[PDB]
């Protein structure tokens, strides 16, 4: 069986402009393992992104967290781009600092 | 610590 990832884009701390924070994209509940996750600042991918090691949930679905240090500003638009085998086209989830 | 099957 194959499962499509649930994607969440969020900050580690409450967002306030001009402060250094962490931008995270949590991909959970997918199968098989190989996923492609990029972080985007105004459409361009962030080059210094880390990710946790691949573990899985109790239904055997995998979860990963891609994170990088950023500094939210009022104009800068952030997003997460996830490609999976179950996906018609690379999905793009925008970061909502209220979410 | 980890476990390892026999073999």
């Amino acid at each position: 069986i194959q499962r499509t990832p649930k994607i969440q884009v969020y900050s580690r701390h409450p967002a306030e402009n001009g402060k250094s924070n962490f931008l995270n994209c949590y991909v959970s509940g997918f199968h098989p393992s190989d996923i492609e996750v990029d972080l985007l600042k105004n459409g361009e991918r962030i080059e210094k992104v880390e990710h946790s090691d691949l573990s899985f949930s109790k239904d055997w679905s995998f979860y990963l967290l891609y994170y990088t240090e950023f500094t939210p500003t009022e104009k800068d638009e952030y997003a997460c781009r996830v490609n999976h085998v179950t996906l018609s086209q690379p999905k793009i989830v925008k970061w909502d600092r209220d979410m | 610590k980890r476990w390892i099957i026999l073999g």
Partner: protein, 275 residues
Amino acid sequence: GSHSMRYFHTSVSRPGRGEPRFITVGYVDDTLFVRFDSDAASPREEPRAPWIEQEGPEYWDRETQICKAKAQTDREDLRTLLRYYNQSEAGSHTLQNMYGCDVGPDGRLLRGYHQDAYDGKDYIALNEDLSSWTAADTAAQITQRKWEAARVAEQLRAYLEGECVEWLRRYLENGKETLQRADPPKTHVTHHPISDHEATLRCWALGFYPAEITLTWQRDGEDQTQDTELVETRPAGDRTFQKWAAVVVPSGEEQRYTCHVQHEGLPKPLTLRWE
């Protein structure tokens, strides 16, 4: 309270491009503490929690050897499962193993676990008696009969009642300042107008450990579990987790709705309103 120690392992064949990718992690409750990736230069188990860096070179040496040996056995098992199901060597397949133990407040074992999955579905699982196997299909029954010939359940039970509980209590003592503190959740209620007659109430639970949390919305004391968007608990980049629950209400009747948050780290269940 009760505490967990688990090891997860994942092996994925890479037809054409080379050896299977093997990646394993160890968790104490919801705190990751060991990792291993076969794609490293000289792959080696590394500490991911502060209280496990105390262990000596013989520890990390034995762990590194165990992980390399598990990678080898996983290649073996992948080939065998290929021939069990009459599958094509050109297709990629996944093997996932978990094992571990749950101990109680008295440090005594409540349950041991050992499960194996092929291509994301249950393959074979050690029953709770630590003496029998549940096999998902006839191929898993082949494996079950071969593992009953080899007393794999007996090895596993010797490990679970013995080394698992002992070393879990050891890890717990070593880092009790972190592993044994229940971080209560910072909770607040946010309001976001979506239209002139509607607005979202979002109930947050930032900053909490362990992950087990209960967020519920209630409209005049009646649960709105079907009209409440509830997102999965996510890591905050540290050992702390986050989670929120949203409900869309008519602008003017916010005080009909109440959030309710339950966490191990809270003395009493909390009830919140938008102010």
